[PDB]
Each structure stands twice: as structure tokens, then as C-alpha cells.
């Protein structure tokens, strides 16, 4: 209760941390608009040593916390009920950072908001500091930013909508530029109040991406993945995720002879059987698996093959007890 | 007729030593060098890209903050102070800075602000010509640190201002032109990104490092006998482009785009070797990351 | 948090022909190239160095004016007009020319103004530019001359405006980057001080020529067989510094500071010959005069 | 905000430290007496391990925080305006110690006040504890002492005044006797209110000391240095400072042949050129330099020479842009 | 400065089938295709002849009615609904359309209206370029029918609107240009009268039918080997002029003026045979009955 002498001074403890409760969502209707407020987390920030890095990976994949109720990577409970509406408006939203490391962890972190959604995620240390809404902060003290709202209603991303910039409240991000260690530091909570209007039949929750050696990116659906998948001719069909959760996939390739997908030795763990067939001109392989984060080498599938023409996947989110013949 | 911007940006990092007294992260203190003026590119880093398109200013309110970066277990004393004329000499011992009328010390694990009083008069922005550079500034800012116990970056300082420009001039750009020879130094031209410190004589000696953050585009020509390639790796700043290079008999021209974090270490940024050298030139611009030389 | 800038500046020169139709000084006319947007470096000159530090703009007033820099003894009507959607394809006849919602036809020796209305909307500037640059602009400006005349310069167009920026970005650069292989249809980034008019195949063909005024700092690499030195003189643009150059075996790098103006005479500005070439790169930026090379 | 359990107890944090502001001085006149109150620092205490030590060096140089408005070693802003008066009186003065190390730094420190000014600075551990005004304290908690004032007016030390004991309010000191490490620990602030009376033409701010093999100490002016300079016959003319700041010096020696002053390899850094001439019977060398602290071996000038008779210096305080031909 | 018209015109007919679920009178539903926008010539039929002379609009109030045409003894369910973005996919079963917030069903022998809410913002009219075509529209309208028991036209739907145009553009016309080859489809240009469905390969196969009402003027060129004459009789639409025609060896050009009612059947409208064909072109304009090719 009493800190030892002297008096009236600044004291630095070993750790400070708020304790949180999982409050329920609460609804409210008003003039045909349904209003819902809730709080959940997004991710936990991890730092490197001696290297600038933003959003837990070095490629940093522009977007990826695109603030929009259809985005599953940021909101984890909102988008499965936001697919019943075609318009929204944020009435209040703030990002809360709460630490979970000791005071002896070093490396000053930051989190910030941009208004558009294709500014290519800065690399210089000085370019981070000059956003209009940010918080410089040490990695052991809580920091919160508000992000300003509008009156304009936007759309809730049911189609491809390639100029995905007029329908977004902005973009959220965070970065670290010192350190330290290679541990978790804290986790970012977001609490928010939204509106919805003009109810709709339920849209899909299934991504369909295509990739040949060319146009990247002829995709549709909610971006569980984005254009980060490597194939040229060689032992090259690499898929890796960044969004957490557990998914149901189905793949189809084309070209010369192939091999089996070697998922072992990387992120994400099997849960079923993954039946596979092919090896002459095309092959199909479906699976179901869970994954956690994360940024690392030797990515999550490394389908080799010999000489390839096209590849295309379908991704959908599903629980545990949906796998194959167990 | 008078614009009025309000912004909060970065200045520089701080680096303490093991129990001495340093002002603005060097010995010998480089008199001036943080004169607060919207064209001084060495302290502001977003402001002077628009102060080149004006001539007069008036700071309506300005404060300097200091946020921590280090662990709470590191000893130190950081201090922030302000003299109202630009070329009174900087102090040399820690006992002197208690006498400044606008000062604020504090431990390196807590935030620290100070205001700096303004006045309702207008000044000029151009500083390449005014000797003396004394009535064209609103003052002079300097920080200092005096304790142990490491050599690590233990924070940085941010400004929070409000300006009033008037009667615009045409934008000449933000490029530098740094010549150098084995002799008189250094005949700069432009803003002050970098710096009257770039070691080169005749031997394996053509060294340039930076001390301001940000991403940059540099071109350079050299002269003399056989020049080796610039091996940029090992020091501060990382390559983002392709680094084209040519020559090696009488001259060698090479462009680069990169970004540096500013904090320093040993083995500086570029470090061309060469064999026997005469002179060198540098043009430094600040530009973003999309404009990289592709491979 | 809304700055407000009022300023007046130049766009481009106007040249006419011996009795034909032409929009914006060429016949291919390259749809949308004078879209009005604060980050359009081909339209504004002083503005986009400020505009690359913000996201949301709003013109509060904008007014175009045409002054004659020509004698009163020559004929050929000029015209100014404005279209609020940014890719209607640039008409061909005289008849549909002078019937927009805002236009002012005039003779080539008289001063001619053009108001253009504003909206109370926030629009983004340009940031990794979209595929329908139509919701982000406040309109599209173009001029046209017909039934001259001669083949000389007969005036230039100035812009008065007033803007409100908001939501400050980090400092994007003002340098651009253009690569050109053989059969290229170039990829670029940053502003647009040039567009895809820079011809090269394998022969004495490595050409680039400007249209926008002002001083410039360029760097350029080439690749292939032996490369001749660039021969600047004979056409547009005047050298101001040293022009260092090296290479001639597989790749040559050269850097220039220069100033150019206005009309293209019938020869491009730099004209490297070479003997066999693969690809060329450029890095254009806008500087002032004293950032030259001093040998 | 809330310390974890239990409740109503004593908690030890990682660090405590006050944050300070550089308040301006403020003047006041009353009945012909000018009254001025101000706060500034003096030094930062550094400790050894396993050895008793007082005022950051082992020789400890009796005096050296002699509390008097002419003393530059303690007050750093006062003496340049206290040279316009011939009498003073302290109305309120306290010494404040504020920590800057972590809790894991050990070695209990102390600071104390004596009333005279030639008590020879104790060496025994027990002799430290029994001063009439002191504070035993750990090196991580703030401790303050007041020091009692009088009504008696004293003089402000414009002359040699060899019995420099009736004109002083006392003597300040501090010491450490355990540890620990070899780091800085904290710094001592002094806040004080003075008076002045009977204004004067401005006296000098220039010390002139002499030294031969004999009478030590035939000096004048403000004691920037004190009798700590070694010369006997041999390669022996050693000068080292303890007061911080930057100075203008001029030296003159006598005797047999000499050598150049080798300032490199110790405390204090060059700033100009130091022209030097001589080498037959006498030699002159001036310089200008800054120094920081400090107590170490191989002192700051080590003028060697061969066989010497006298040496005498002149010291004055001056800013940076006063050096030779740059 | 802003015009304001109020009008009530025709959209299209409705045709039910024997007990299935069809949306907008076809299977596969053709995503979009009734995006409500004054340039969408596929739903309005008097409006876009004046919306080509403007750029912006704002519907101030708009309702859609459905009047009956069939006998009262015919079973059916017609429905009218509206999604507020233009490229959400259309429903595929009758169970889905109960979830739309603005819907109104009814029997095919009674009148049925629905409103559609507006908003006070202005959009653009041009849709040849905006991908995505999503923020330039006020919504998307579609009807559907789900019962028996015939294949007859059982009504039609009418709009009743009020628009506010502003800042006119010059009238380019209303012509189409529909190229086609045995391969990629179809590279339209202009309004959407007709349609990405016109069957032709090489055999007795060059078929074009319409689905919008009105009187029209079409020209067409063909290519390949021997072409037969267009036998227009037997299908929808009646000749009103002379039908001139020429050629039959490498190409054949033919103009026609006619009117079609739109409702469909088998054996489509024109149906040229030919022998072996390469490509075909069509220009379709809407024009009245006095402009017929006389005999
Ligand atoms: Ca939607
Ligand atoms: Ca000027
Ligand atoms: Ca931004
Ligand atoms: Ca005296
Ligand atoms: Ca138009």
C-alpha cells in the first residue's frame, strides 16, 4: 500500500497490467438501424531485435487490418453477423494496448491509424512518427488511441470491389523498432460501436483466389488470404496464412506431374486425413486444419510439382468436428 | 492570406554514455545546429518540405516532449532547455544547465515536456545567407544527458507546434549539394540533412554516414585513381533498391535509395575504398519508398 | 486540423498549328492527363510538394486564366473547358468542344478566364493509385486550339485556387522512377514529370524529353553494349553544372542538373546513341539552381 | 493503479524518480537588499565497490563544496552575478537528492553539512554517521536535508582571504560506503534563497595560482583549481581539474629544457590549436578546452620537462567559440 | 442551374414459366443489368436520351409500379425488390426474396407498387469505365415470378421518378457498336440496348434478337464467304421500311428500320445464314417511324 521513501516521487514497478472481462455484446435498434457495441482482441505484438518491423512480419502485406466489418482479420465476432447488411457506420472506436511483459523488456512500440487503405506501410523509422493519430510508447505501459468517425455510410464488402478504399474507415497498424528479445509484449484490444442498415440475404463467407504466372489476383470473397503465394515453374506452390483460426480448403492445380503436399515442417497442424489424388496433368487435394499466426520460413504447404500452369484455392472457416474420416 | 498548420513530428533520438556530459549527441557540440526555424531540416522532418514554399513564419505555440524508450531499470538524467538567441555557446558541464530559465529535467523512463514562449513578430526562413543568423530565429533548442550506464538509444523527442506562413516563394526543392576535397570543408548548399563530417583522404577512405532518420535518394560522383564499389552493408541504413554503379578508372557515379534509422554505431554507412582520390560530390533528397530502382 | 492554402501558379504553355484540331498540345491527347487533383504534378507545380503530406483535400475555389504571350498579328481560336468526370474521352469536333457546362472560348490575343465550381466533399489525393481515378478528383481540365495560325507558342495557362488539407501523412517523396525495356509500356511510381514518351530500341535510340518547366536533377542507368556519352545540346533544356559520365562497356550511369522550358522543338533533349540496348532507368526530381555539380 | 495482493502493505517498485522542471530565477528588492531564489544541480554521485569514498574522489580535497556564492563548483549560475556585491545572507537552503538508478543497485549513501570549512572530511565509516545534519539513505530513495541559516552577513570572496572560514555558511559533502557497481546513482539538487547588499564594481573571475617546490599556494581569484598539481624536478608538471565546464588557460614555466604538453590520454578534450613555444629556459603554452569531472589517473596535461623551478597558471571560464585559429 | 424532370415510363414486360423461379426473364440472371442509373438504357426508355447530355444526377423520389395484363384466372406470384448495391448477386430460389427489406409481392391480376428510398448525394452517369460500378448507382432493381401456369406475357412494370441533373456534357449520341467474332465476347460500346447474346458461328448462323421495346435503326456489316439475305420474317419485330441489302461474296452491308415488342419467342429476329463467317458488327440507334427507307 505504501511505497518506501522518498515521498511524492515517481516509482517504477515490476509490472503493471489491467485485468479484463469478456463483456457480452449488446444490441439496440433505432429508426430501422441496428446498433451493436462490443470489445475483442485482434492479435499480440511480438518484436524482433535490432530491426524495424510492422504488423509481425517483414513483407507487411498492405491492408491486413483494413478497418471494415467484413474484415475477419481484425474483428473476429462481428463479420459473421455483418454479412446480413449492406451498410454500416462506426459511431465510436478506440484501440487499447495493454502490456503483459515485465519492466525489464525494452523496445519502444507504437500504433497508429491511417485514413486511406493503400499507403504502403512505412519502412523508415522517422516516417512512423508523423501520422496524425498515433502513440509513441514504451513496451510496458498502456496506450490508447481514438480514431475519428464520420457520418458517411459505407458498404460492407460483399463483392470484389477492386478499389477497396472508398468503403473503409481507414487502416489500423502497429510496429516496433527496438528491442529487446523475441517474446510477446502485449495485445491490442478494440472496442467499438457500429450501426447497420438495409438488411440482406446472407452473403457468402468463402474466398476464391486464382493464380497463374501473371495477373495475380483474380479473386473474390472475404480476404482470408491475400496475394502471397509463390509459384513460377519449379517445385513452387507455396501457401501460408496469417489470419488465425481453422479452415476448410480445397485445391486444384494444372500442368505437368506433381507430388503430394508436404504440410509437415511449418505453421499449422493437420486435423483430418487430407485425401489426395492426381499426378499426371492435374491434381486435387482438400484438407482441414488450424493455424496460429505466424511469420516464419518454409511455408505452410509447399506443394512441389514439376511444371505448373494455374492454381486456385477455396477457403472457408469452419470448426473442429468437420474433418475427414476419423 | 496566411496559412496555419498544426502538427506533431519527430526530431531525433537520444543516446547516453557511461557517465559524462554530452549535448545533442556529440562532443564539441556544433554551435547552433538546432536553431528552431521552419527551414532547419536538421530538427523538423515533415515541416521543411512545405516551408520551402514560403518566406515568413510565426510560431503561435510550440512545445517539445520527450517520450521514453528504454527499460525502467536504466539510470540517467535527460534535460531539455532553450536559449532565445541562436549562437550563444552551448554549455560544457552539467552544472551550467540549471541556470537556463526554461528547462525541465527528468528520469529517462518518464515523459517530460517543456513549453517555449512565442512572440507576435514575423521572421524569415532562409538561412544560407544571413550572417549573423540571429534575428531570423525564434531561439535554440538543445538536450543533454548526464549519467550512466549504457550506450543505447533511450528515447526520442517530438515537437508540437503551430505556424503561420505568408507570401509564398517558388519551390526550389530540397536537394543538397555537398562537395568535398582534401582540404577546406565543406561548402554545402541547401538544407542541412548531412553534415560537416564525412571522412575521406586518399586511401581506402570515402565515408559518409547520416544522423537524421528517413528514407533518402542519393547520387554521388568521385574522382581520382581506381575506385572500388560501395559496400554499404554492415552499417546503419538498409538498401531498398538495386544500387547501380559504374566506373573505376577516373570517376565512378552511383545512385542509391535507402532508409536509415538517427542512431549510429561504428563502421559507417557507405565507405567506398578507392586507391587515390581528389574530390567527391553528393546530392541528397528525401523521397518515399515506391521510387526505388527496380532490378 | 485543417490547413488552408491560397496560391497562384503555372500549368503549361500553349502551341497551335496550321489549321487542324488539337487538345492539350498533342494529337494522341492521352485521356485524363490534366485531371485536377492536388497530387497531379503534370498539372500543378508548387502544390504537390505540399500535397504529398496529407490525405484529404477540398478545393474551396479554383479559377483558370489564360494570358497571351504572343503578338496580336496572328489568328487561331483557343478554348478552355472543364469536365467533372475524369475519363470522358476528349472530343474531336469543334461543335461538341464549346458546349460544356463551364467553358470560355476566346481569341489567341485576349485574356480568358474560367471559373470551375467546387463541392463540400473530402477526396483522397492519390496513394498507390486506383483503377477508377474518378471518385477521387474534383474534375478534369483541358484546353484546345483550332484553325491557326502558326507553329509557335501563343500563351500559357495559370491557376488560382484555394484548398483545405487534412489528416497529415508521413513525407512521401517527390521523385519518380521510370523503367523502359524494349516494347515496354513503362511502369512508374511517384509523380509524373514524364509520361511514356521516351523512345529507345537498340540503335542510336535512347531518348527522353520533357514538357513541364522547371529545374531538374536526373540520374540514369543503361544496359547493353557500348554506350556513347549523352549529347544534351541542340534541343530543349540548358545545362547548369558539370554532367559527370562514366561507362561504355556494359552499363553507364550519368547524373545531370538542368533547366528546361515549354515547347518541344523537333529533337529530344538528351539523345544517347549506344549500339545495343536492353533497358533504361531514370530518377527525376525537382530542385533549385544551386544544387548543381561544381566542376 | 492497483498493486496486486496483499493489501495495506509495503511495496517496492522497480524505480522511483521525480520529474523536474527548470524554473526561472526570480528577483525581489526590499530596503536596498536584492533577494533571489533559484534551483540548480551540483554533480552526480558515482560509487566504487567495497571502498569508502567521499565527493567522487579519494583525495577528497578539503573544501570543494564550500557553501559561498562565489563558489563556482557548487552554484553554477549564481557566482557570475554574485560578483557584483560584497555581502550576502542565505535565507533558506536545502539539498535534494533524487535517484536515477534501479532498485537492484545497492550501497547506502549519505549527505551531510558541516558548520566550519576546514574539518578534514572523514575517512572512518563511523565518523560519517555522527554529523548534526545528515541523512543515511539507500541509493534508490530520495532524501533531503535542510541546512540552518543565520542573520549574520558574510563576504562574497573577492580576495585571497586565507582564513576562508569566517565568510562561509559551512561546507556541503556526500559520500558512499558500500556497493554495488561503478555507475551513476543520482544527482543532488540545491534550491536556495539569498540576499545581497552593497553593490560593487564587478570583480574578476580569473584564478592565478603559483607553485614552486615549496609554498604551495600563493594564489588568488576564485578557486577553479586548488593545490592539486604535481611538480618536483623530474618529468613533473601535472594539472587536473575537478570542476566541470570549459576554460581558457595560459601557462608559463621555468628551468631547464622542456617538452610539449601531452594533453591526450586523459580527462578533458581539446577545442582549438594550443600554440606552444619554448624549450630552452622557459616556455609558454596557452589552450582552451572543456572537461567533465572526473577522477582518474594520468592527469589532464602531464607537461614533462627536465628540471623545473616554478610554474604558474591563469584560469578563466569562457564559452566554446573563443578558441584559436579555426 | 439544376434541371428537374418528372416522368412515368415503361421498363420491360414480365413472362412467367410453368412452375420455376426466374429473375428478370432469364436463367443465369445476368448480374447487374437493371442497376438504376439514368444512363442505363436497359430499364429506362425515355430518360437516357436526355441523360446523355448531363453528368450528375440525384433521384429525388422514385417508385416502381406493376400493372396487370393477363386474365384474372391465371395463377402466379410476381414480386418486386431492391438491393442498395449494384453487384450483390441475385437470388436463386424463391425462399430468399422474403429477406429483402424493400419487397412487395402480389398476384398477377392486381396492381403492385413499391417505393425505394433516396438520399441527398449526387453520383455520375457514365458506366462504360467504372469498375467497380458500385458507388455510381442508387441501387439495383429486380423482379421475379414463381408459379405456373403458362408462358405468356402477364404484365409489365413502370417507373415514376424525379431527377436532378447538373453540369451538362455534350451529346455524343445513343448509338451502339457491337463487334463479335468466333471467340471472345463481345466488346460493346455505348448504351446497353442489346446484349451479350447473339448466336453466330460459321454455318447458317448469324442471329440477333432484341429484348427491349421500341423502334430502331440498325446497320450491320458481315465478313467471310458467301452470305445470304437476312430473312427477318417469322420472328419478333416488324419491318416498316424497305430493307436494302447488297453483297454476298466477302461482305454484305444492310440497313433496316423496324420496331419490336420486349417479348420473345422462338425463331429470333434477323437470322442471316451465310456459308462461312469471320466477324460481324452492329450499330443500333433508337429513332421514330418517319425516318424509314422509302421504296
Ligand atoms: Ca454488399
Ligand atoms: Ca522568396
Ligand atoms: Ca496516410
Ligand atoms: Ca569583496
Ligand atoms: Ca462530361
Give the closest residue to D208 by CA, choosing from D316, D306, D280, D105.
D316
Report the gap between the CA of D218 and the closest CA in chain A (Å). Answer: 45
Strand-pairing partners, residue E114, are: E64
Q: Which residues contact A318 (CB under 8 A, 6 or more apart)?
A: A246, A247, A248, A288
Do B213 and A107 lie within an 8 Å CB cutoff? no
State the span(s) of chain A assigned CATH 2.60.120.20: 23-202
Burial class of E93 by CB neighbour count within 10 A (0 to 12, 13 to 18, 19+): exposed
For B244, the closest of C168, C221, C294 (CB atoms) is C221
Go through chain A and list every residue after which a break occurs, taking a C to next N gap over 2.5 angstroms, comma-separated: none
Strand A11-12 to D15-16 pairing: antiparallel
Kindly report the nearest CA distance between residue A110 and chain D, in angstroms. Answer: 22
- Name the H helices within B140-281: none
**A127 to A58, A130, B210, C207, E57: CA distances (angstroms):** 16, 6, 16, 36, 41
Q: What are the backbone dihedrals phi and psi of residue D169, each rounded to the nearest 5 degrees, phi first?
A: -75, -15
Which residues does residue C179 pair with via DSSP β-bridges, in sequence order?
C187, C281
Beta partners for residue D94, in sequence order: D146, D191
SS3 E219: strand
**Given CB atoms, is E89 within the 8 Å cutoff of chain C?**
no
Residue C117, φ and ψ in degrees, nearest 5: -75, 160
For every residue of chain C, which 3-state class applies, written as one string? CCEEECCEEEEEEEECCCCCEEECCECCCCCCCCEECCCCCCCCCCCHHHHCCCCEECEEEEEEEEECCCCCCCCCEEEEEEECCCCCCCCCCCCCCCCCCCECCECCCCCEEEECCCCCCCEECCCCCCCCCCCCCCEEEEEEEECCCCCCEEEEEEEEEEEEEECCCCCCCCCEEEEECCCCCCEEECCCCCCCCCCCCCCCCCCCCCCCCEEEEEEEEEEECCCCCCCCCCCCCEECCCCCEECCCCCCEEEEEEEECCCCCCCCCCCCCCCCEEEEEEEEECCCCCCCCCC
Yes or no, beta carbons of D44 and B146 under 8 Å apart: yes
**φ/ψ bin of D218: left (φ > 0), alpha (ψ from -120 to 50), beta (otherwise):** beta
Helix or strand (DSSP H, E) at A125: helix A125-129
* Residues, chain E: 295
The whole-angstrom separation of Cα E233 and Cα A113 is 66
Give the 3-state secondary structure of residue A126. helix
Q: Which helix (H) or strand (E) holds D188?
A: strand D184-199
Query: For residues A39 and A75, what is the distance between their CA atoms, to the nearest angstrom?
Result: 9
Instruction: Say whether D116 counts as a known binding-site residue.
Output: yes
Please choose, from the candidates E95, E97, E100, E96, the residue with its C-alpha nearest in 3D space to the C-alpha of residue E85.
E100
DSSP assignment letter at D217: -
CA distance B279 to B177: 13
Pick the residue of B12, B48, B67, B194 with the most A CBs within 10 A to test the interface with A by mutation.
B67
Distance from C-alpha of E116 to C-alpha of E139, rounded to nearest angstrom:
9
Q: B283 pairs with which residues across the strands?
A: B219
- Report the DSSP beta bridge partners of residue A11: D16
Does residue B154 sit in helix, strand or coil? strand
Residue among E199, E253, E249, E245 at smallest CA distance from E225: E249
Rounded Cα distance between E161 and E163, Å, is 7
Chain centroid to CA A274: how far?
Answer: 25
Backbone angles phi, psi at B49, to 5 degrees: -80, -15
Provide long-range contacts, Cβ within 8 A and 24+ apart, for A221-225.
A221/A315, A222/A70, A222/A71, A222/A72, A222/A79, A222/A157, A223/A63, A223/A71, A223/A73, A224/A72, A224/A315, A224/A317, A225/A313, A225/A315
Give the integer Cα–Cα distance in Å for A122 and B288.
9
Q: B167, B232 in Cβ contact below 8 A?
A: no
Selected residues 138-177 of chain C with any CB under 8 Å from a CB in chain B: 168, 170-177
Alpha-carbon distance of D113 to D105, in angstroms, equals 25
Q: Note the helical H segments in E9-82.
A: 48-51
DSSP character string of A89-113: EEEEEEEEEEE-S-TT----EEEEE
**Given CA atoms B34, B40, B42, B46 in this order, what sign does their dihedral have?**
positive
* Cα-to-chain-centroid distance, residue C30: 12
Calpha distance A144→A140 (Å, rounded): 13
Other beta carbons within 10 angstroms of residue A270's beta carbon come to: 13
Expressed in angstroms and rounded, the spacing between residue A167 Cα and the centre of ligand 5 is 25
Q: Which three cell numbers stand for residue C29?
A: 491527347
Residues near D12 by beta carbon (within 8 Å), at least 6 away in sequence: A3, A4, D103
DSSP secondary structure, E132-188, as one string: S-SSS-S-EEEEEE---S--SEEEEEEEEEE---BS----------EEEESSS----
Q: Distances in Å between the alpha carbon of B188 and those of B176, C287, C291?
A: 7, 15, 9
- The residues that bridge with E83 in the sheet, in sequence order, are E140
Q: How far is the CA of C261 from the centre of ligand 2 (A)?
A: 21
Q: How far is the CA of C50 from the centre of ligand 3 (A)?
A: 14
Q: For chain B, how big is the Rg over CA atoms in Å?
A: 20
Q: How was this structure determined?
A: cryo-EM
Cβ E193 vs Cβ E208: under 8 Å: no
Residue D69's nearest CA partner among D82, D60, D56, D59 is D82
Tell me the shortest Cα–Cα distance from B46 to chain A, in angstroms. Answer: 7
CB E190 within 8 A of CB E49: no
Residues 6 or more apart whose CB falls under 8 angstroms from that of B183 comprise none
- CATH number for domain A23-202, candidates 1.10.645.10, 2.60.120.650, 3.40.50.720, 2.60.120.20: 2.60.120.20
Residues 6+ apart with CB under 8 A from B4: B60, B162, B163, B164, C3, C4
What length does chain C have? Answer: 295
Question: Residue E189 and residue D193: Cα distance in Å, rounded?
Answer: 89
Other CB atoms within 10 A of residue A160 CB? 16
Task: Report d(CA E245, CA A83) in Å as an integer.
Answer: 56
- A127/C170 CB distance under 8 A: yes
Q: Under 8 Å CB-to-CB from B225, ≥6 apart: which residues?
A: B249, B250, B274, B275, B276, B277
Q: Give residue for cell 465550381.
A: C117
> What is the spatial distance between Cα A39 and Cα D312, in angstroms, rounded to a whole number?
77
Query: CB distance B7–A130 less than 8 Å?
Result: yes
Chain A residues whose beta carbon lies within 8 Å of the beta carbon of residue B155 = 108
Q: Grid coordinates standing for C236?
A: 530543349
Cell of C270: 538528351
Using the structure block, give the residue that is written with the C-alpha cell 556494359: C250
Output C135-139 pairs: Cβ under 8 A, ≥24 positions apart. C135/A163, C135/A166, C135/E135, C136/C37, C137/C35, C137/C36, C137/C37, C137/C86, C138/C36, C138/C37, C138/C59, C138/C62, C138/C84, C139/C35, C139/C36, C139/C82, C139/C83, C139/C84, C139/C85, C139/C86
Residue D7: count of CB within 10 angstroms of its CB: 8
Q: How far is residue E26 from each of residues A66, E64, E93, E197, measured CA to CA in Å?
A: 38, 20, 14, 12
Please state, in angstroms and rounded to a whole number, the distance separating the CA atoms of residues E53 and E173: 9
Please give the Cα distance from D55 to D121 (Å, whole number): 9
Identify each DSSP E strand in chain B by its residue range.
6-7, 10-15, 22-23, 56-57, 62-68, 78-83, 103-106, 112-116, 123-124, 140-145, 153-162, 178-181, 214-224, 238-239, 245-247, 252-260, 277-286
Strand pairing partners for A246? A290
CATH 2.60.120.20 domain span(s) along chain B: 1-171
**CA of C30: how far to CAs of C44, C159, C197, in Å?**
17, 21, 11
- CA quadruple E122, E128, E129, E135: dihedral positive or negative? positive
H or E element in which residue D174 lies: strand D171-176
With contact defined as beta carbons under 8 Å apart, do D217 and D227 qualify?
A: yes
CA distance linking residue E219 with residue E284, whole number of Å = 7
Q: Are A254 and A309 in contact (CB under 8 A)?
A: yes
- Residues from chain A contacting residue E100 (CB–CB below 8 Å): 199-201
Joined together, the cell numbers standing for residue A60 give 507487411
CB A273 within 8 A of CB A324: yes
Q: How far apart are the first and last CA of chain E?
A: 47
The rounded distance, in Å, linking the Cα atoms of C143 and C23 is 6
Q: Do A4 and D141 touch (CB under 8 A)?
A: yes
Query: Could you give the 3-state DSSP secondary structure of residue E48?
Result: helix
Give the resolution value in Å: 3.2
CA distance A6 to D17: 9
Going by the DSSP 8-state scheme, the letter that residue D71 receives in this structure is -
Tell me phi and psi for residue D270, to 5 degrees: -65, 155
Domain E1-171 class, CATH top level: mainly beta
Q: Are C179 and C186 contacting, i.e. CB atoms less than 8 angstroms apart?
A: yes
Residue found by looking up cell 511514356 in the block: C196
Helix count and strand count (H, E) for chain D: 2, 19
Subunits in contact with chain A (3 or more CB pairs closer than 8 Å): B, C, D, E
DSSP states of A199-256 as a string?
E------EEEEEEESS-----BSS-SS-S-EE-SSSS--EE---S-EEEEEEEEEEES
- In this structure, are strands B103-106 and B78-83 parallel, antiparallel, or unpaired? antiparallel
Amino acid at each position: 500500500n505504501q511505497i518506501v521513501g522518498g515521498i511524492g516521487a515517481i516509482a517504477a514497478p515490476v509490472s503493471i497490467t489491467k485485468r479484463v472481462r469478456g463483456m457480452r455484446p449488446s444490441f439496440r435498434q433505432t429508426k430501422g438501424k441496428v446498433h451493436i457495441v462490443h470489445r475483442e482482441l485482434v492479435t499480440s505484438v511480438i518484436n524482433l531485435v535490432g530491426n524495424f518491423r510492422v504488423n509481425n512480419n517483414v513483407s507487411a502485406q498492405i491492408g491486413q487490418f483494413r478497418i471494415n466489418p467484413s474484415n475477419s482479420s481484425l474483428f473476429t465476432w462481428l463479420p459473421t453477423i455483418a454479412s446480413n447488411f449492406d451498410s454500416y457506420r462506426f459511431t465510436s472506436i478506440r484501440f487499447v494496448y495493454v502490456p503483459l511483459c515485465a519492466t525489464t523488456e525494452t523496445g519502444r512500440v507504437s500504433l497508429f491509424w491511417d485514413k486511406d487503405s493503400q499507403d504502403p506501410l512505412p519502412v523508415d523509422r522517422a516516417a512512423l512518427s508523423s501520422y496524425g493519430h498515433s502513440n509513441e510508447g514504451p513496451p510496458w505501459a498502456e496506450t490508447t488511441l481514438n480514431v475519428p468517425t464520420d457520418g458517411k455510410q459505407r458498404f460492407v464488402t460483399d463483392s470484389n470491389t477492386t478499389d477497396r478504399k472508398l468503403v473503409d474507415l481507414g487502416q489500423f497498424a502497429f510496429a516496433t523498432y527496438a528491442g529487446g528479445s523475441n517474446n510477446q509484449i502485449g495485445d491490442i484490444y478494440v472496442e467499438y460501436g457500429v450501426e447497420f442498415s438495409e438488411a440482406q440475404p446472407a452473403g457468402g463467407l468463402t474466398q476464391y483466389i486464382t493464380k497463374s504466372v501473371g495477373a495475380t489476383a483474380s479473386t473474390t470473397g472475404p480476404s482470408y488470404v491475400v496475394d502471397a503465394n509463390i509459384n513460377v515453374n519449379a517445385t513452387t506452390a507455396n501457401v501460408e496464412f496469417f489470419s488465425p483460426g481453422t479452415f476448410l480448403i480445397t485445391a486444384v492445380v494444372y500442368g505437368s506431374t506433381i507430388a503430394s503436399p508436404s504440410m509437415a515442417g511449418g505453421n499449422g497442424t493437420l486435423i483430418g486425413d487430407l485425401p489426395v489424388v492426381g499426378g499426371s496433368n492435374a491434381s486435387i487435394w482438400t484438407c482441414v486444419f488450424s493455424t496460429t499466426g505466424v511469420s516464419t520460413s518454409v511455408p505452410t504447404f509447399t506443394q512441389a510439382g514439376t511444371g505448373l500452369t494455374r492454381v486456385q484455392y477455396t477457403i472457408t472457416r469452419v470448426n473442429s468436428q468437420t474433418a475427414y474420416q476419423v
